[PDB]
């Protein structure tokens, strides 16, 4: 049938990284959620007309299991490497996600991309050309999204199942 | 007919309801939104009692309504102003007769008993299982004292004069079994000599049943303070979180003492031992429904570090090779077989904590604090109900001990237990997969041979008790 | 899963809440602080069935005794607890058997008889007489110690069987 990409949501906790796929996976337009039900993480979608099946890994609040990356991220084919755009530390964190996602993988060429997430109205102190220049140091694709307004969100992901697709 | 209840104006609980004031879902009404003069109202409602929605409430009001203020409100649903004379009262009066006061006496039986035993009951579930919210306001404390303790007249006394020692035992501040625990097991290393302690010199049962006694202690002390408001992922999670924090660092220090010590282990033969002794390990865990220890065993032989050692792989029995598989299997499908395990073990047991926090947090991000109706603002109380279900289902498992006896010394090795050292993360996890590539490098490099280590025996002893008279 | 809701009820002072406590917990409390109405939850796996116990602990003293009908209306099975050195408790039994007739308007409710404290030698309710009014009932009686914990899984579990093959 049709093919299903195991995607994993990655970066620094409490600054807003579950409204990335909170939003993706809602009811888009009733802002509501139980993460509890079977399937709460599961979205069939349609990426330039190829319909797919996203099925989302986001263990966000459990950071703190830092020896448990691997095994998290050891289920995924592409990689979300989420930092809030006020939070310098979590864009400083990025490196060395894509330094464990490699290890993991055995692999110099994962697919990933670089969001830049706007979790509140908090000023920002990670400028858009910072992270385009991190982003293409890497070779990867640079997607901002606001936490609030869906804008952003699609994008992230379908430009990450295209990374998948084009690998 | 209904009682008549106090005009609105002098006593605001009898507003009717209105979808202005209070949304219920699709045999008690199940509260979906509402001001917060109506969550207290049926808080304290007068025709059923609500023990769910009281641990719910005072569970998670704290998004929406401060400790003070809960206590300014909750005595004044207290203070009901009674009802006037009925005009066959008054007729009666006008004769020198004692009236019958009959809707004055069932207002009191049906009405203020009720709902006054009720705020009593807010008063003491708030007390017995909430109490740091008094613990962090001494001001809050001396208010709560002083309304119990100037509550007047005889319905009320015994639950006046209870819960007034009840907060006094609380400002101050032992397990029965249906058996006997099992006799604690021994292998190389002897009772009192806890300088050759180690992974393979202790008994496996008994490094499973000691890790499990810890963990469980670690599980049981997080209260549900450590979790609302999503506290232990902001700034502040070190003071707001400090026990679930103690917890999952316990548990990531074993994962990264169990890879510690299979890529430390440089011969291969003693390092297909120590890979063989944590899987037996890992199966007391399985047995004493420890899922916190499961977990951490799958996390390290999952590491980077570890999942590459070929070599090693090649020499573990499959027969130990399926208990690994069946215990990573309840991992998969976002933790489906795990869910479905833990809903059908009898307890006691040790939960990973991990899926509650996530689930938490994602109710808090995924849900509004207020719904619009109306042009009014809500309290969304169903995101609120949907936390306190989690939280809820956390304390059931905290309920039930284990019946096995503590090693004082053994307990005291894992507790102290620091793989890491000095050394931060990055560089001790940098270490460890250096060390793997060291042992088993990349092909077409060649294998190398190394020197055994260990100069005692490496046969396990087993992972089935033993019972001497 | 099932979910069995269990409420226990009975005179003040005859350990409902202590015999709660003691299944729930393991731990034995000595003080009286009378309920008002508490709840507790315990999952546990019964004649080879897992199901989750949902435990209402009533108030026994008699400045609640107007406030019964609501909970009565959500129980599934009763306990009806009185106390071995306790004959008041125990001729209040029949008035909690008969509310709990009359609010589920049934003659079948699932009941277990609770004779409470029976590690104290000073006994004044005899086992026989209990007997006798449990069979009267057609339902069985169990004496429990919350303190020893000496029959206290028979009874919670007794009645749970008792919903079970109702
Ligand atoms: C040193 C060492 C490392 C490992 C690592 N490891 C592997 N190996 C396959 C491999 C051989 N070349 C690659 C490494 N598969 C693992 C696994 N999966 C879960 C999903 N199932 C469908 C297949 C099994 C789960 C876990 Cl938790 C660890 C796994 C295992 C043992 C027993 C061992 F002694
Ligand atoms: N020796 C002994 N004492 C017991 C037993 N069960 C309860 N008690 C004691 O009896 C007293 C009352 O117990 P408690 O559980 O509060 O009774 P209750 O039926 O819940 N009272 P209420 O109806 O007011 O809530 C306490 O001091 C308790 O320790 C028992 O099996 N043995
Ligand atoms: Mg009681
Ligand atoms: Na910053």
């Not at chain 2, 232990?232 to 700034?235: D, F, G, L």
């Given at each position: 049938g049709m093919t299903e990409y195991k995607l994993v949501v990655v970066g620094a906790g409490g600054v807003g990284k579950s409204a990335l796929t909170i939003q993706l996976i809602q009811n888009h337009f009733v802002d509501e959620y139980d993460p509890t039900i079977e399937d709460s993480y599961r979205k069939q979608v349609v990426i330039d007309g190829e319909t797919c099946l996203l099925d989302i890994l986001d263990t966000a609040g459990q950071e703190e299991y830092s020896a448990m990356r691997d095994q998290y991220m050891r289920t995924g084919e592409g990689f979300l490497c989420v930092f809030a755009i006020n939070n310098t530390k979590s864009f400083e964190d990025i490196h060395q996600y894509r330094e464990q996602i490699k290890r993991v993988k055995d692999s110099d060429d994962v697919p990933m991309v670089l969001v830049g997430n706007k979790c509140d109205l908090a000023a920002r102190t990670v400028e858009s050309r910072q992270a385009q220049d991190l982003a293409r140091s890497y070779g990867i694709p640079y997607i901002e999204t606001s936490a609030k307004t869906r804008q952003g969100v699609e994008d992230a992901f379908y430009t990450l199942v295209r990374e998948i697709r084009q690998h | 007919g209904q009682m008549r209840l106090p005009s609105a104006d002098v006593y605001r609980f009898a507003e009717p309801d209105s979808e202005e004031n209070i949304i219920f879902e699709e045999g008690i009404p199940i509260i979906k939104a509402g001001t917060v003069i109506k969550l207290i109202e049926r808080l304290t409602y007068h025709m059923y009692a609500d023990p769910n929605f009281v641990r719910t409430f005072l569970t998670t009001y704290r998004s929406f309504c401060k400790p003070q203020e809960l206590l300014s409100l909750i005595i004044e649903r207290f203070e009901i102003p009674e009802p006037e004379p009925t005009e066959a009262d008054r007729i009666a009066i006008e004769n020198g007769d004692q009236p019958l006061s009959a809707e004055l006496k069932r207002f009191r039986k049906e009405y203020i008993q009720p709902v006054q035993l009720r705020v009593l009951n807010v008063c003491r579930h708030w007390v017995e299982h909430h109490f740091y919210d008094f613990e962090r306001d001494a001001y809050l404390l001396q208010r709560m004292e002083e309304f119990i303790g100037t509550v007047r007249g005889k319905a009320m006394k015994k639950w006046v004069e209870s819960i007034t020692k009840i907060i006094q035992r609380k400002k101050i501040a032992n397990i029965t079994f249906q058996s006997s625990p099992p006799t604690v097991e021994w292998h190389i290393s002897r009772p009192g000599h806890i300088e050759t302690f180690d992974l393979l010199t202790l008994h496996p049962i008994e490094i499973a049943r000691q890790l499990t006694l810890l963990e469980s202690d670690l599980y049981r002390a997080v209260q549900p303070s450590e979790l609302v408001g999503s506290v232990?992922?902001?700034?502040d999670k070190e003071i707001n979180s400090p026990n679930l924090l103690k917890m999952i660092r316990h548990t990531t220090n074993l994962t990264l003492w169990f890879e510690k010590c299979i890529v430390e282990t440089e011969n291969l033969e003693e390092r297909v031992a120590v890979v063989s002794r944590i899987i037996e390990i890992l199966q007391v865990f399985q047995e004493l429904n420890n899922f916190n220890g499961v977990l951490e065993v799958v996390s390290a032989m999952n590491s980077s570090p570890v999942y590459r050692l070929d070599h090693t792989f090649e020499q573990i029995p499959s027969r130990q090779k399926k208990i690994l598989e069946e215990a990573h299997e309840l991992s998969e499908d976002h933790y489906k077989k795990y869910l479905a395990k833990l809903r059908s073990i009898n307890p006691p047991c040790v939960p990973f904590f991990g899926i509650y926090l996530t689930n938490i947090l994602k109710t808090e991000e995924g849900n509004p604090e207020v719904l619009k109706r109306h042009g009014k603002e809500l309290i969304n109380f169903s995101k609120r109900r949907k936390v306190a279900e989690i939280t809820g289902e956390i304390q059931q498992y905290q309920n039930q001990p284990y019946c096995l006896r503590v090693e004082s010394d053994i307990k005291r090795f894992f507790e102290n237990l620091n793989p890491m050292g000095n050394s931060m993360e990055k560089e001790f996890t940098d270490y460890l997969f250096n060390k793997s590539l060291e042992i088993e490098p990349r092909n077409p490099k060649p294998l190398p041979r190394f020197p055994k280590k260990y100069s005692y025996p490496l046969k396990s002893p087993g992972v089935r008790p033993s019972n001497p008279r």
């Open positions: - | 232990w992922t902001k700034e």
